[PDB]
């Protein structure tokens, strides 16, 4: 299948309570493999997956150095952003960054990403061409001008096409037992009466990986999109994910409803019914 590597930075200011906190996590697909927290007793990039632990001291020294440099740069960016938005130094604010690469089955670059936000809103983003920028407002346009003048996009492009893809390929090989294994959902339908003339049918999906899944209800073969209650996909805590979808049906019509499940770990889509 295709695969992705993503790094996520969060920098959060807290006036009166020290310097901004910087946290960074790294993922391959839906598997976290490293973390960094500036509030830790002794901040270091640290392993969160067994297949990364084999990297040597030069690796961990390198990544730790990067995260301290990044913490410093985004602390300064919080101070800069304050001025760009004419804001007081009393409040707490947040910068977020997500970046990385996607590769196809053959391991070549599908596309790269480098996107930033301020207080939960888009700030600036590297365009898919990896050579121009999209700025969300006149503040981000000031940053865009600086980055254009310094040819920043060229350096990100070189990273995204080169080191990002090369490292992702290495991780996929070292973690092939798990990163390259899809676990299909375990599925069942439950039935619970609401009243004498209505019942809830809930379609469960359990123990699947990766997180991407489609659960749909049909009535007489017609999708019940606007009438289905769909809960957010949630982590089980053991690498896998869980989801359910529910529909309220008239008593006696339960067999007119079917649940359809799509997942990477399934050769063909599943169709389930309530089995009384």
């Amino acid at each position: 299948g295709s695969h992705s590597m993503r790094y996520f930075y969060t920098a959060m200011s807290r006036p009166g309570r020290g310097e901004p906190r910087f946290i960074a996590v790294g993922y391959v697909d839906d598997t976290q493999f490293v973390r960094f927290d500036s509030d830790a007793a002794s901040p270091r990039m640290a392993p969160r997956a067994p297949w990364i632990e084999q990297e040597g001291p030069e690796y961990w020294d390198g990544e730790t150095r990067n995260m301290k440099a990044s913490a410093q740069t985004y602390r300064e960016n919080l101070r800069i952003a304050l001025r760009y938005y004419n804001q007081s130094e009393a409040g707490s604010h947040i910068i977020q960054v997500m970046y990385g690469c996607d590769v196809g089955p053959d391991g070549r670059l599908l596309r790269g990403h480098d996107q930033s936000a301020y207080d939960g809103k888009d700030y600036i983003a590297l365009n898919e061409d990896l050579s121009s920028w999209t700025a969300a407002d006149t503040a981000a346009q000031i940053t865009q001008r600086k980055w254009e003048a310094a040819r920043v996009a060229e350096q990100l492009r070189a990273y995204l096409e080169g080191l990002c893809v090369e490292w992702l390929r290495r991780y996929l090989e070292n973690g092939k037992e798990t990163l390259q294994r899809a676990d299909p959902p375990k599925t069942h339908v439950t039935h619970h009466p609401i009243s004498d003339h209505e019942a809830t049918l809930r379609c469960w999906a359990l123990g699947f990986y990766p997180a991407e899944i489609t659960l749909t209800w049909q009535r007489d073969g017609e999708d019940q999109t606007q009438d289905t209650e769909l809960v957010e996909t949630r982590p089980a805590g053991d690498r896998t994910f869980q989801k359910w979808a529910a529909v309220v049906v008239p008593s006696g019509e339960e067999q007119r409803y079917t649940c359809h499940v799509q997942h990477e770990g399934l050769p063909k889509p599943l169709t389930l019914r309530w089995e009384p």
């Binding site: 946290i23 977020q96 619970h192 982590p235 805590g237």
Partner: protein, 99 residues
């Protein structure tokens, strides 16, 4: 400017009384990142609770998993108690074995 947390409370494996398990409280969709989560057993805070590393979704909203090992019984009742700047007072979501 701010977004209130969605909360789900559930177990890692389907629950059976007397068999060891994990209790989860998944909070997501919230902003900013500061949040307070307690896991409760019969109204009392459980002490040994762990949580995942802060991360966020494509829409920039944050998510966290809080979890603790527990053995369900038919009597005992569990819940999650969450506070956030968007919340006037803590929200309590009870563990229902079928959701």
């Amino acid at each position: 400017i701010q977004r209130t947390p969605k909360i789900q409370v559930y177990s890692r494996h389907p629950a059976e009384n007397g068999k060891s398990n994990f209790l989860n409280c998944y909070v997501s969709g919230f902003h900013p990142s500061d949040i307070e989560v307690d896991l409760l057993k019969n109204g009392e805070r459980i002490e040994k609770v762990e949580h995942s590393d802060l991360s966020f979704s494509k829409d920039w909203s944050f998510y966290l998993l809080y979890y603790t090992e527990f053995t369900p019984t038919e009597k005992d009742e569990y819940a999650c108690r969450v506070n956030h700047v968007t919340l006037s007072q803590p929200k309590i979501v009870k563990w229902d074995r079928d959701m």
